[PDB]
Enzyme design. Structure first.
Site, mmCIF file in Angstrom:
data_model
loop_
_atom_site.group_PDB
_atom_site.id
_atom_site.type_symbol
_atom_site.label_atom_id
_atom_site.label_comp_id
_atom_site.label_asym_id
_atom_site.label_seq_id
_atom_site.Cartn_x
_atom_site.Cartn_y
_atom_site.Cartn_z
ATOM 1 N N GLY A 28 45.197 -23.193 110.383
ATOM 2 C CA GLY A 28 43.677 -22.401 110.686
ATOM 3 C C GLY A 28 43.193 -22.986 109.913
ATOM 4 N N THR A 29 42.580 -24.496 109.991
ATOM 5 C CA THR A 29 41.843 -24.977 109.059
ATOM 6 C C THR A 29 41.721 -26.290 109.498
ATOM 7 O OG1 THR A 29 42.753 -23.133 107.351
ATOM 8 C CG2 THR A 29 41.036 -25.095 106.578
ATOM 9 N N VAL A 56 41.813 -30.426 108.551
ATOM 10 C CA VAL A 56 42.218 -31.463 107.658
ATOM 11 C C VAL A 56 41.131 -32.655 107.972
ATOM 12 C CG1 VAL A 56 44.437 -30.908 107.539
ATOM 13 C CG2 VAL A 56 43.489 -32.503 109.402
ATOM 14 N N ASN A 57 41.253 -33.522 106.441
ATOM 15 C CA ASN A 57 40.486 -34.480 106.961
ATOM 16 C C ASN A 57 41.174 -35.964 106.530
ATOM 17 O OD1 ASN A 57 37.159 -33.874 106.501
ATOM 18 N ND2 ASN A 57 38.143 -32.328 105.033
ATOM 19 N N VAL A 58 41.448 -37.275 106.747
ATOM 20 C CA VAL A 58 42.424 -37.572 107.752
ATOM 21 C C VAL A 58 42.167 -39.401 107.234
ATOM 22 C CG1 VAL A 58 43.658 -36.577 108.710
ATOM 23 C CG2 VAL A 58 42.535 -38.095 110.041
ATOM 24 N N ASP A 98 89.488 -63.353 106.249
ATOM 25 C CA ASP A 98 89.268 -62.920 104.413
ATOM 26 C C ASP A 98 90.400 -61.777 104.402
ATOM 27 O OD1 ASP A 98 87.711 -60.121 105.090
ATOM 28 O OD2 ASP A 98 87.068 -60.023 102.717
#
Ligand code: HC4
Ligand code: HC4
Ligand code: HC4
Ligand code: HC4
Lengths: 299, 303
Positions: B23-24, B26-28, B149
């Site tokens: 509930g805020t 965000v800087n991306v 082998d």
């Protein structure tokens, strides 16, 4: 020279189509000691390059029981082939589809080169969260290596699953890998900040972070923190360690990668929002596997 | 706090993010062009997220349709085959190597060392010898495929030698109408200590006999409980509790690769007679002097 000893032309040896004696060299004491030394088992005939063991891994019966108990629509479990002989037991990871998300990521890069539809990115997000919830809340185990490689898909996203589930990152009562001899490793480009701190605290959120970067891959079809050293506007159609930014790489390890909003659009709203909060610099600020599920379920 | 300067943007607080316990806002940071190229560079796929370290791909391997047909068709009592998990038709199918027991012959030649140190009973060696031969005969005659082998770690044992199977069978070393691997792609690699002269030579020719050699060497392993041509130059400090790279006669090694190793005659007896004969002929410098898998099966099913 070395002591030789002739072996007379016997009848049996003749049955092998070789009728004649054969001279052979001698050896007093077999160098068993050196052949079984730690150096030998490490350098000569590496067990890491051995196919059978890679598949049928010897496990301590206690871990084996835990690994066989994994039972969830979004998790790939294991199976054994005998009752624990005394001590250990071989386990093999079960099948969950022909392709890994990673396979589909690059499959796309070589065609559309177009990001995965937002609808599908969220679907994966749902099932992976569902699976992480089970691992965190039910088994009290931290995956520790989330990424597109460890997400296998069946057909056209018929089923999404998480594989390579460990038993070495037990989640404490405070949802924290407090166990002494327990170290988080994952895969460098996907490591959370606390896994780089060299001293940080590994929480259940370590997975949520990686879970975020995995959604990032479906958006950019790229690896986190791998950027061309010098753009040149995506000039030459060939790349190598020369045009790779060694700089920025070790710098951003544990940080939220730059989002390519330019290439995406509006439908990727929730995707980007979910990706952001999962990659938040601080652990507490990242949702719990469970929160992501209901927050995505019907909401 | 070092960071950097670069385009960013602000994602407004939303009901969604709120519902995620936030509930805020965000800087991306921002990116215009995706490093899709560098990421899929042949370099990236090789040093970052090495598929050679991928667990899932280690067991469920993607094979080309024609190769999967061959691999799926492997069906012999002494051969560990493969299993598919979806109907094929496409141009690629995943296959997982089947199960043939808990221990490999190498595991045993080593539990054996940690205790008895006494060379597997001659009788057991012959048993292992006959079974490997049958499996190798199947590969060479029936499927025209050289194993590639042979060595103890590629032999799996079920219970107390209740079962003996050869594993890790591939299709890249197909055999000629002349019993030689002539395919331009094919390339004998094996495991160094077990390589036959032909595979050590700069451009020797590989035939079904290259398998017979390493097969022989595997019988040697059961008598000496050692790795071929791994000797310490120090007969002197020999018996010193621990051993290091500094006890290994590096020269004698690269000098003996491909040659028949020495036989600990004094540690064996007369019941090891057939075993020692079989070992000798299978390790002749000349392939034409080594018996075929067929001839070994017959000679061992003797009478
Ligand atoms: O092929 C292997 O498994 C081992 C190769 C190797 C090469 C040189 C050594 O000194 C030891 C092992
Ligand atoms: O996942 C499955 O259905 C089966 C997996 C499997 C893996 C290894 C085997 O040897 C057999 C089955
Ligand atoms: O863990 C990985 O998958 C990759 C590790 C890695 C280490 C150094 C590099 O420059 C690239 C990848
Ligand atoms: O050959 C195998 O081991 C497996 C065959 C197979 C055929 C159809 C299936 O649906 C799954 C496996």
């Amino acid at each position: 020279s070395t002591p030789t000893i002739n072996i007379p032309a016997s009848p049996f040896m003749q049955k092998l189509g070789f009728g004649t004696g054969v001279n052979v060299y001698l050896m007093k004491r077999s160098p068993r000691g050196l052949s079984h030394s730690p150096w030998a088992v490490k350098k000569i005939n590496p067990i890491c390059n051995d196919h059978y063991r890679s598949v049928y891994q010897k496990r301590l019966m206690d871990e084996a029981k835990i690994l066989k108990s994994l039972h969830h629509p979004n998790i790939v479990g294991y199976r054994a082939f005998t009752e624990a002989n005394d001590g250990s037991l071989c386990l093999a990871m079960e099948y969950g589809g022909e392709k890994s998300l990673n396979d589909l990521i690059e499959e796309r890069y070589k065609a559309s080169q177009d990001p995965f539809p937002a609808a599908i990115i969220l679907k994966v997000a749902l099932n992976m969260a569902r699976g992480l919830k089970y691992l965190h809340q039910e088994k009290k185990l931290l995956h520790g290596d989330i990424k597109s490689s460890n997400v296998v898909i069946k057909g056209d996203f018929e089923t999404i699953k998480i594989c390579d589930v460990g038993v070495s990152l037990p989640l404490d009562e405070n949802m924290e890998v407090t166990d002494p001899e327990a170290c988080y490793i994952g895969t460098e480009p996907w490591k959370p900040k606390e896994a780089v701190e060299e001293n940080g605290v590994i929480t259940d959120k370590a997975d949520i972070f990686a879970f975020g970067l995995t959604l990032w891959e479906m958006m950019t079809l790229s690896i986190p923190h791998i950027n061309l050293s010098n753009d040149d506007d995506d000039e030459d159609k060939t790349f190598d360690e020369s045009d790779f930014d060694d700089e920025a790489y070790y710098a951003a390890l544990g940080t939220r990668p730059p989002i390519n909003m330019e290439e995406l659009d509006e439908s990727y709203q929730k995707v980007i929002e979910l990706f952001s909060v999962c990659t938040n610099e601080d652990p507490k600020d990242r949702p719990s596997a469970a929160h992501i599920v209901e927050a995505l379920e019907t909401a």
